[PDB]
Amino acid sequence: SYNYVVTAQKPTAVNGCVTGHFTSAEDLNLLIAKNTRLEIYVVTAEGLRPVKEVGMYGKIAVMELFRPKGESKDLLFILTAKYNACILEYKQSGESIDIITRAHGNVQDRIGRPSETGIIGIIDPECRMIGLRLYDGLFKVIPLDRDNKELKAFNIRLEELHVIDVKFLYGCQAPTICFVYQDPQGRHVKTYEVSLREKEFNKGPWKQENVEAEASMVIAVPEPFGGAIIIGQESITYHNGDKYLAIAPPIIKQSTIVCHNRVDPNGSRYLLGDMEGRLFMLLLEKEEQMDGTVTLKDLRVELLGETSIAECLTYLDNGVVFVGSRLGDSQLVKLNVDSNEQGSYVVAMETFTNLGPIVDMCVVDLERQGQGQLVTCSGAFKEGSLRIIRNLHIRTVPLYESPRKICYQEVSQCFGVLSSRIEVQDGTTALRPSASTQALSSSVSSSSFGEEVEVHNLLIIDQHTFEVLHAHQFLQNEYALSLVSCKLGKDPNTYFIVGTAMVYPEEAEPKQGRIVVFQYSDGKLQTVAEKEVKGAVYSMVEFNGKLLASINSTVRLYEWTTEKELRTECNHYNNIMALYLKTKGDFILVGDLMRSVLLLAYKPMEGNFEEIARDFNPNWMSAVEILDDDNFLGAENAFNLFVCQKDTTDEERQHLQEVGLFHLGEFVNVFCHGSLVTQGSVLFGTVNGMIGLVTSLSESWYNLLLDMQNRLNKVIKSVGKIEHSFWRSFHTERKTEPATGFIDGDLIESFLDISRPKMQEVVANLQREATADDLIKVVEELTRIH
Amino acid sequence: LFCPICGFTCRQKGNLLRHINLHTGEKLFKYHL
Amino acid sequence: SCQVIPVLPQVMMILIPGQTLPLQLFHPQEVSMVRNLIQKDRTFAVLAYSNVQEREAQFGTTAEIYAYREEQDFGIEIVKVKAIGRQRFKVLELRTQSDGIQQAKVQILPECVLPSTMSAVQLESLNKCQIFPSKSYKWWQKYQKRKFHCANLTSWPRWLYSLYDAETLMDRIKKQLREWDENLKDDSLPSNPIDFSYRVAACLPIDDVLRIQLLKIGSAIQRLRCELDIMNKCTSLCCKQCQETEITTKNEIFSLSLCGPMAAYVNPHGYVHETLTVYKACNLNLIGRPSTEHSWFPGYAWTVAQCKICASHIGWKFTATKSPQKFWGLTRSALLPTIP
Ligand SMILES: Nc1cccc2c1C(=O)N([C@H]1CCC(=O)NC1=O)C2=O
Ligand SMILES: [Zn+2]
Ligand SMILES: [Zn+2]
């Protein structure tokens, strides 16, 4: 199988941000790390001014800055999710900018299981070593001498397997490590002293202490204080040897504190963000002992205000804060000395678009010029919205609740959107005004104390004004899974059909579910038909004028009788749960979460499904799709794409061999046919917000482009010197296979950027002998599609 | 007269042979009796 | 990867890893085989016979002997052994020595251990909270709300990812097992999905072909899901030969003493019966008189039981003089589970 993958919209989620003097020792820099993309901005009075934006062959994962003695500017340490560590330096020669690679290496332990708490990276404040926690019970150390040009590392065997969080401590005679670890007794903070000469731990400066049962964040306070600060949900505790100061303010009780930052160089002020987007300031008050040293007196916390759900917080000088978010738009908030009348000190200066997470998407030609636009359901919680993408121009429509699915009715000129909002049980009370609660007309379906329930709505949204025309609230304790718009049977009306599952917390697998049929006309959404089923309706498709439903582990076919009632025609008990259902012609693709693809065909004359092929390869999927009659494309675990191909013996005719793999580097929620401007064009969304595009090449072009790639990989220089075939190798957390049948579109499209002298050596002896002009024309032709 | 497999009891043979033959097993007598 | 292992022929039962298999051995050939194997590696291999012709085996398990004894009574070399299944192997070829020595070239299958569902989409910021104190309904409702908090980023809800989680799926099996024993201490069962699934598979009344199906599923989560599927949907047991005469329902299944609901026992003549203990039974006629003899359960006399339609031996009725006064033991081979 031959395929072509191009990224039509670079990832926009923010993995993490750092601040420091990277570009120059005289100016401030802010480094954002979106998935695989590193953006270096220069901070100024007006705001961020982009200076560089590079793309690494890896997920940034860990990023840090450090200025070892003897350097003018700060070096940048990046460890990727594939364990490619690299120390980089920024070198501005005249008007030309290029990131130099001081050192690189692959710090991976062969035998081990990745820590369930996640990769942790930390740097000694004196910059003597780099500490990495990758695997339980092992603490990897990288000395930072000038001889480690390959990042040689050695492991220290920790005894406390479960380590929640770890930091280095400011102020000591040897690099000290303080960490919170959980054992059956509870959570304890413990300190070790790292010794390079012996390559092991020694008893720390102060013994272990017991802490809050959830104590799950460690902050290393700088001089003159020293010591550490431990944060949970319930209490904040400052430990420094004998000194112990605990404060349990009621204002942080409601939400977990998930990110932190140091505002002032002396640690007097810290910024804390919680899951629901609130921003607090943690104050440290100091006393001066007569003929002694400064000591901490008390800890105070006050609610600065409300921002976007905070994934990373950094403090740009002059009271600016860059709130990054993976669930919503990032922003630059301004901290005032006094609160506005609403009672909050935080105001918003600028907002940065974040398309991800893309939970569903659909291609629609609103203006009918033959080049369709795209609509995506982005964000979660209060950040949810609809993004309208066209040729790359993006428009936003906030909802203030999580959108889940989407479909388009051409005749009604409206979008159907499933949405979910969280309501407290204190009847239930809404938290904030939402799209579903502020609809022009509302309908309600009929047929503990602080617990948070989910209320689900179907929203009819006009396609031009994007105002919520209608909102239909579903039954209590009902969860809507699927949304398909289609016309069934000979019926001339067009319907919004919804699948829902009745989920009670006491149960495990839903027993009851519904298939509802709504008709939107004359400004009203009336329920036309309703079917009770014994299961959850995970997926639904329009199968040649019939409704294909996935009732638990079953594919059922409903015909639309003249009396307007769904009527069963055939069933196929197919063992697995038919979560992913796709159709083309007569072939049906069925899959569950753990791979297990299964291709059926609906025998028309007989009237019952017959299994045609199946492939059971236990591995998590994100979504599947059909490229053509014979090729199916899906996403496996660890951010991978894969292609199966239906085909001699019967066994060979019933085995969907994999004929292509690719480490896309993102989670692919949804695939959808359509192009925004090679046969076919399957767009796909992602969690990071990247929108990609897959097309089917011809054999000749596929060979040509594969050879051109293999040639480029010997010319183009990647940041940190990461072999391209390594970054595109398949990955399953203990296994790797080379990519096959997939042409990396970004690498090819980068051919245009390189200048003529490199062009000539890239094109030499390729495949009449081709010349730079012919390859330029071919690459232009490839660029046209996206 | 005992059935070597299940413990069925009888006073004559014919019932015993019928009962043993009714068993749906490999009846590896040479490895059991 | 690849190895050669010997097979004793008299053992006809699909052994599941972790299950305890007791045997008596009579004929000289197996006596020599066991006395040669005991000194060497105890790698007894038992083939799951797909064909009752004893000449077609695809999957099997490498049993391990852990108890050995000899009883030279009756003037002859009776020997009694107890082994346990360890690993699952694929039959490459059957290189019989032609002496009845069924030497098999096989390969040891692995266990495909997958990572947690939400290990790819995990939010790195809140990843520190993934660790949480271990300690009930509210506790599970909090476990689901904490571990799959990132389910918002993907197109499926939390409760759909809780159907594939090892721990939440273990808990349901634990509940439905405790409903059978009434004295199953939480700590008796293992603590990891592989061992737990293998142990549960060894107590269900799966007849022959739904075991070779379980025995050939590599993924532990797959085995847990399939076991819970069997345990929920199928609740009635019928005669294997008749296939249509109900003898009992799962709710009457009753464990006795320390062993689970179903346990392996050996009759006086060396045959192996996986007996399942139940309070009540129906459609069975009793023959004989209550006689103790070699009663498996001390203090109980037994009478042979066979279904009143095809007269095939189904089990025994155990009674005692004295708790419970009357119960039944049904051999697993003769029982076929069926969907109500
Ligand atoms: N005395 C005999 C004699 C022949 C066969 C059997 C027994 C016998 O006791 N059992 C079972 C049934 C009774 C029991 O519980 N233990 C057994 O070994 C037999 O199959
Ligand atoms: Zn018998
Ligand atoms: Zn019968």
Numbering used by the authors:
A (entry chain A): 2 to 392, 710 to 744, 748 to 768, 781 to 980, 984 to 1013, 1024 to 1113, 1122 to 1140
B (entry chain C): 17 to 49
C (entry chain B): 77 to 211, 220 to 406, 410 to 427
What text appears in the publication on this structure?
IMiD-bound CRBN recognizes a small β-turn motif often found in zinc-finger (ZF) transcription factors.
To understand how they influence the affinity of SD40 to CRBN, we determined cryo-EM structures of SD40 in complex with DDB1ΔBPB•CRBN bound to PT-179 or to pomalidomide. In IKZF1, Q146 (equivalent to Q18 in SD0) forms a water-mediated hydrogen bond with the phthalimide amino group of pomalidomide. As SD40 evolved to bind PT-179 and PK-1016, both of which lack this amino group, this hydrogen bonding opportunity was lost. Given this molecule-agnostic mode of binding, we hypothesized that the reversion mutation F18Q in SD40 would restore the water-mediated hydrogen bonding interaction seen with pomalidomide.
